[PDB]
């Protein structure tokens, strides 16, 4: 239930939040809302054991 982000386009200025989840693209071919090749979801769980 507890999530965190890998990567973002730019650094964070202090004391704010980012709520919206957008599929990042690091290539010429756009993601177009599909998490396929060169497309990664930003948020995943901690997975505590």
């Amino acid at each position: 239930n507890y999530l965190y982000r890998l990567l973002r386009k730019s650094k964070l200025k202090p004391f704010e939040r980012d709520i919206s989840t957008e599929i990042y693209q690091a290539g010429n071919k756009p993601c177009n809302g599909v998490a396929g090749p060169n497309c990664y979801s930003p948020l995943q769980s901690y997975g505590f054991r």
Binding site: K13, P14, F15, E16, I19
Partner: protein, 31 residues
């Protein structure tokens, strides 16, 4: 109503009637 984060109710804001405003966004604050 769709992630209500903050509310603010105060004195009236808008009251030969030139008015001036400055808005700046510094380190997590709005002045």
């Amino acid at each position: 109503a769709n992630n209500c984060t903050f509310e603010y109710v105060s004195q009236p804001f808008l009251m030969k009637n030139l008015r001036e405003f400055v808005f700046k966004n510094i380190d997590g604050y709005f002045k």
